[PDB]
């Protein structure tokens, strides 16, 4: 019950911060074909728009 407020606090502290944003706008970009061909699994696939969850 009380953990979602901490999640909201963290998401305010990092997501909308401009300094945190500018470190991760277009860094480490991967494509779906190179996501599947390199054996990536989980969030990486879900980072690239691939819809897959076990």
């Amino acid at each position: 019950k009380n953990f979602s407020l901490r999640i909201d606090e963290l998401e305010e502290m990092l997501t909308n911060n401009r300094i945190w944003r500018n470190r991760t706008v277009d860094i480490g970009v991967v494509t779906a074909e190179d996501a599947l061909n390199y054996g990536f699994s989980g969030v990486m696939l879900r980072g690239s728009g691939i819809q897959w969850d076990l």
């Binding site: 019950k1 979602s4 909201d8 998401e11 305010e12």
Partner: protein, 70 residues
């Protein structure tokens, strides 16, 4: 028997969605506040700099009066 069980009515709702407040003035308000502070500072600096120029002129004319004996 006795065991770890949720109560008869169950547990209450738990919040799990994002809740950002969305707060502060509109940008026109801070722009107007900054512009008004700029104008007030400009006016006060104008008045005090004119007074300082008058005082400097007074001191210089005192120096000019004092010069011949020195």
């Amino acid at each position: 028997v006795k065991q770890d069980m949720p109560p008869v009515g169950g547990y209450g709702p738990i919040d799990y969605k994002r809740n950002l407040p969305r707060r502060g003035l509109s940008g026109y308000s801070m722009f107007a506040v900054g512009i008004g502070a700029l104008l007030f500072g400009y006016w006060s600096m104008m008045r005090w700099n004119r007074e300082r120029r008058r005082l400097q002129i007074e001191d210089f004319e005192a120096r000019i009066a004092l010069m011949p004996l020195l």
